[PDB]
Copies of this chain bind each other. A is one copy, B any other.
Amino acid sequence: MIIDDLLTKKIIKPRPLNSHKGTFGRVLLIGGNYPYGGAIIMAALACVNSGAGLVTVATHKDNITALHSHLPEAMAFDMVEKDRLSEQITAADVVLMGPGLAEDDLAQTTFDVVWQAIEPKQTLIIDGSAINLLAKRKAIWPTKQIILTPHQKEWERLSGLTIPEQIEAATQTALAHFPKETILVAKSHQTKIYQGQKIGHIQVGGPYQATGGMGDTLAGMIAGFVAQFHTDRFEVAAAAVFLHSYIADQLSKEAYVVLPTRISAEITRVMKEMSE
């Protein structure tokens, strides 16, 4: 099936007048480990602009200033602070780990803190280098509400499929190995969304998106969507994926390359349009 605007218009519902906060969810982002700070800033920017009720960032000490230059709306702390990181996991509804996390000792220590602190009611998004980190180890998943957002090569690491042999049928079968509800966002030329026996295709998107930080922005948007829209999780993530490229398509008419932060700036205006 094809993910289009009508699906996205189905998900992006006008906000209930009464319910204020909580309803719109709390996300914790974990990443931007040296030297990949910008990645967590771009996911943060996307997440806030998508309408997450509260956004909290666990990042490198020396990257907090730059984050706040862009986004004072998001609390940020040193990810090495083990007890605060723990407290913040329990306060979060959605945990996005991976953008700019890297693979050093601090990343593995952190991965393992998060992995032991995740609760069953929480949504866990595993992005970028955290896919490699998930691959090195294994048996019980701390939640069933798992979203994977790997690159062509990172998904290879997790599933054992080379880029030529990452055909729909092969990716689909490698998924039946993770919990049934697991959503996979196969970031690619044409990104596809997998869950169980469902495959979603986006027709929107173009070469103006082939620029550094595009995936981080996508990760942030998916996190913001799942935080506030509690209906079918596959369609919610699918909508996030559609809108990301749909905005890029709009910005392309007047831009040779569409920059990740330029897409983030446009998010609410377009979500507003999508809500009618």
Contact = CB atoms under 8 A, between A and B. Distances in A.
Interface of A: 12, 15-21, 23-24, 34-39, 41-42, 45, 48-49, 51-55, 62-66, 68-78, 84, 189, 206-213, 252-261, 267-269, 271-272, 274-275
B256 A42 contact: no
A45 B96 CA distance: 28
* Stoichiometry, copies per complex: 4
A120 to B, nearest CB: 25
A220 to B, nearest CB: 11
18 contacts: A17-B206, A20-B209, A23-B210, A24-B211, A34-B77, A38-B74, A48-B211, A48-B259, A52-B211, A54-B212, A62-B64, A63-B68, A66-B68, A69-B70, A255-B272, A257-B268, A258-B268, A259-B268
Given A15-B208, A35-B75, A45-B72, 11 more contacts: A15-B206, A35-B77, A54-B211, A65-B66, A73-B211, A73-B212, A75-B212, A255-B272, A256-B272, A256-B275, A258-B268
B74 A212 contact: yes
Contacts of A255: 268-269, 272
